Design an enzyme around this catalytic site. Structure first.
Site, PDB file in Angstrom:
ATOM      1  N   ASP A 106      16.106   5.234  -5.652  1.00 50.37           N
ATOM      2  CA  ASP A 106      15.600   5.079  -4.426  1.00 50.37           C
ATOM      3  C   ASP A 106      15.848   3.637  -3.984  1.00 50.37           C
ATOM      4  O   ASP A 106      14.962   2.849  -3.461  1.00 50.37           O
ATOM      5  CB  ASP A 106      14.137   5.080  -4.363  1.00 50.37           C
ATOM      6  CG  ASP A 106      13.533   5.408  -2.959  1.00 50.37           C
ATOM      7  OD1 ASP A 106      14.117   5.686  -1.882  1.00 50.37           O
ATOM      8  OD2 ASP A 106      12.321   5.078  -2.531  1.00 50.37           O
ATOM      9  N   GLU A 110      -1.756   0.954  -4.769  1.00 50.85           N
ATOM     10  CA  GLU A 110      -1.557  -0.362  -3.866  1.00 50.85           C
ATOM     11  C   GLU A 110      -1.140  -1.606  -4.764  1.00 50.85           C
ATOM     12  O   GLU A 110      -1.299  -1.399  -6.168  1.00 50.85           O
ATOM     13  CB  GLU A 110      -2.844  -0.754  -3.070  1.00 50.85           C
ATOM     14  CG  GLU A 110      -4.088  -1.030  -3.739  1.00 50.85           C
ATOM     15  CD  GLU A 110      -4.899  -2.009  -3.245  1.00 50.85           C
ATOM     16  OE1 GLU A 110      -5.895  -2.630  -3.763  1.00 50.85           O
ATOM     17  OE2 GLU A 110      -4.736  -2.350  -1.904  1.00 50.85           O
ATOM     18  N   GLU A 113       1.088  -1.267  -0.192  1.00 48.26           N
ATOM     19  CA  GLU A 113       0.034   0.036  -0.105  1.00 48.26           C
ATOM     20  C   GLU A 113       0.994   1.220  -0.071  1.00 48.26           C
ATOM     21  O   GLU A 113       2.191   1.283   0.001  1.00 48.26           O
ATOM     22  CB  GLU A 113      -0.758  -0.181   1.244  1.00 48.26           C
ATOM     23  CG  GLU A 113      -2.418  -0.312   0.819  1.00 48.26           C
ATOM     24  CD  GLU A 113      -3.277  -0.725   2.050  1.00 48.26           C
ATOM     25  OE1 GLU A 113      -2.950  -1.579   2.868  1.00 48.26           O
ATOM     26  OE2 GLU A 113      -4.376   0.139   2.440  1.00 48.26           O
TER      27      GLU A 113
END
Ligand SMILES: COc1cc(C(=O)N2CCC(N3CCN(C)CC3)CC2)ccc1Nc1ncc2c(n1)N(C)c1ccccc1C(=O)N2C
Length: 260
Positions: free
Chosen positions: A120, A19, A14
């Site tokens: 990331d 999601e 989520e």
């Protein structure tokens, strides 16, 4: 709870990044993962996702728009995240850390060779198949840093602070590749010590200052054997043009050390 052939059977993850659902075809039984966003940004993401073809990177199967909701169909990594293999304050056995690091580096070499930076890298985004093969996932922050063989420098702030390289806080513009390398070293630290060394890499951060003064009698470094620690000394270097490159990581002694 269905899109065309597929039953959306359970919640896998989520966030503000939509999601992720487990999706099982009623006909064929093939299980996959579907990311659901309530919808510029996604156009770029999908575009990046379609370039991806390597065993250490999550595969893209395709997408469907249905009014506002985009569905993105992707490889399912049924072993979950690397995050969940990291024991707090301990890490994992050094041979598993090594194998995961190898696989991470293969993944990152691939992305970089097609001119993509992930931006990331962290254990939450490193997923495991059923044979514990690591897959680099989540391309919602990724971008193109090389096109027609011309490098472009980055300027946007992206990432997660404890994983982010120090140039990103301090330089107007920076090279993409050493940013992803830095974050791989933070991942390696987390794997070997079960703890992150600093909240962010700035000079107002005591733990960051202590590393630059080489106080490796402190945690997390004291938990880490001298061979991988020497590789960490080459990766976690504040000047990004002195920081080790991937070709040179491949020649590192611990990298090539045979382990259990
Ligand atoms: C069956 O495959 C997975 C299992 C698990 C996992 O172990 N759990 C543990 C239990 C959890 N809950 C169920 C609901 N309950 C209320 C609480 C417990 C559900 C998920 C986690 C991930 C799985 N697979 C998976 N593959 C590809 C991804 C992705 N994830 N997501 C969620 C991603 C996560 C981060 C970054 C990228 C992705 C991703 O894009 N994909 C495609």
């Amino acid at each position: 709870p269905f899109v065309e052939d597929w039953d959306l059977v359970q919640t896998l993850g989520e966030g503000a990044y939509g999601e992720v659902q487990l999706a099982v075809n009623r006909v064929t039984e093939e299980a996959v993962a579907v990311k659901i966003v309530d919808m510029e940004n996604i156009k770029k993401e999908i575009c990046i996702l379609k370039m991806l073809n390597h065993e250490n990177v999550i595969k893209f199967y395709g997408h469907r728009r249905e009014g506002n909701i985009q569905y993105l169909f992707m490889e399912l990594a049924s072993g979950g995240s690397l995050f969940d293999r990291i024991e707090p304050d301990i890490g994992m056995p050094e041979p598993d850390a090594q194998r995961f690091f190898h696989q991470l580096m293969a993944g990152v070499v691939y992305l970089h060779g097609i001119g993509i930076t992930h931006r990331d890298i962290k254990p939450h985004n490193l997923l495991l198949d059923e044979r514990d093969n690591l897959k680099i996932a989540d391309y919602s922050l990724a971008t193109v840093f090389r096109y027609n063989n011309r490098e472009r420098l980055l300027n946007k702030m992206c990432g997660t602070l404890p994983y982010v390289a120090p140039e990103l806080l301090k330089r107007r513009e920076f090279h993409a590749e050493p940013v992803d390398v830095w974050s791989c070293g933070i991942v390696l630290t987390a794997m070997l010590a079960g703890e992150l060394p600093w909240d962010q890499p700035s000079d107002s951060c005591q733990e960051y200052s202590d590393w630059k003064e080489k106080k490796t009698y402190l945690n997390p470094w004291k938990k880490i054997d001298s061979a991988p620690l020497a590789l960490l000394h080459k990766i976690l270097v504040e000047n990004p043009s002195a920081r080790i490159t991937i070709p040179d990581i491949k020649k590192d002694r611990w990298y090539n050390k045979p382990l259990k």
